[PDB]
Amino acid sequence: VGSLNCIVAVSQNMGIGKNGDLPWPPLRNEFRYFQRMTTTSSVEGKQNLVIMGKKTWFSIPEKNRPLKGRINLVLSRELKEPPQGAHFLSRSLDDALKLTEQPELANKVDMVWIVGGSSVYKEAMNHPGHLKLFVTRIMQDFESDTFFPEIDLEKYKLLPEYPGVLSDVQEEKGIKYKFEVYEKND
Numbered sequence: 001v002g003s004l005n006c007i008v009a010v011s012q013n014m015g016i017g018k019n020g021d022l023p024w025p026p027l028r029n030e031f032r033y034f035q036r037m038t039t040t041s042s043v044e045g046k047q048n049l050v051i052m053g054k055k056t057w058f059s060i061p062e063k064n065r066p067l068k069g070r071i072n073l074v075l076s077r078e079l080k081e082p083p084q085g086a087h088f089l090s091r092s093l094d095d096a097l098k099l100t101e102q103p104e105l106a107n108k109v110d111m112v113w114i115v116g117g118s119s120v121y122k123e124a125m126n127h128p129g130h131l132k133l134f135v136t137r138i139m140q141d142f143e144s145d146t147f148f149p150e151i152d153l154e155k156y157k158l159l160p161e162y163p164g165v166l167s168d169v170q171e172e173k174g175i176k177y178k179f180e181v182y183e184k185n186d
């Protein structure tokens, strides 16, 4: 198994969701960016693994679940089995990352992408080790009910460039946004 990564889109007031939906109107190219960065492996014959909480799973549109060409793992302590369409179920972030140690997965998985939500991000981000955050800055405030945890810029270095990631400002539906990549190693 290769690199551990989080990916998120976040408004200026740190919002990531409202009532199980995006706070902003759908941004097609932003979702395409998410799909491209989480799907692309750097190693032939492997897939990347996406880890998400239960509410995140159910927040993804049905026609896009499971996230195609990725192994999908959902976190829950209530569920008895993976939801319809999902591939794996774990009871904790550690359990899920341990699972990728199992032999028949440890040779299948390249990158691990935590794709939401708030609590899963927060534990990964405060856990020692090497971790990258792919953050889309949506450059307006939006009413939200779920927020991205604080990024400690003492530990998370903003990279000045990253291959495959546009550096200029994007705009869709009159909403400006920009891509960033942060890296810590502690």
Ligand SMILES: [C]C1=C(SC2=[C][C]=[C]C(O[C@]3(F)FC4=C(C([N])=O)[C][C]=[C]N4[C]4O[C]([C]OP([O])(=O)OP([O])(=O)O[C][C]5O[C](N6[C]=NC7=C6N=[C]N=C7[N])[C](OP([O])([O])=O)[C]5[O])[C]([O])[C@]4([O])F3)=[C]2)SC2=C1C([N])=NC([N])=N2
Pocket (backbone or CB within 6 Å): 007, 008, 009, 010, 015, 016, 017, 018, 019, 020, 021, 022, 023, 030, 031, 034, 052, 053, 054, 055, 056, 057, 059, 060, 061, 075, 076, 077, 078, 079, 090, 091, 092, 093, 114, 115, 116, 117, 118, 119, 120, 123, 135, 136, 146
């Ligand atoms: C993913 C993505 C995309 S696609 C989409 C579409 C539509 C919608 C969505 O979503 C959203 F809005 F978004 C957000 C995001 C961003 N912005 O980015 C991401 C994700 C998600 N989101 C949102 O937010 C929210 C969710 O929430 P919360 O609350 O935070 O949740 P979760 O975490 O998921 O859940 C909870 C549950 O689960 C479980 N858990 C958790 N954790 C854990 C667990 N278990 C065990 N362990 C652990 N550790 C629990 O359960 P139980 O069963 O146990 O009880 C809990 O409860 C909402 O609102 C949503 O929506 F949001 C999406 S586009 C994009 C993306 C990304 N990622 N990135 C980018 N850039 N873009």
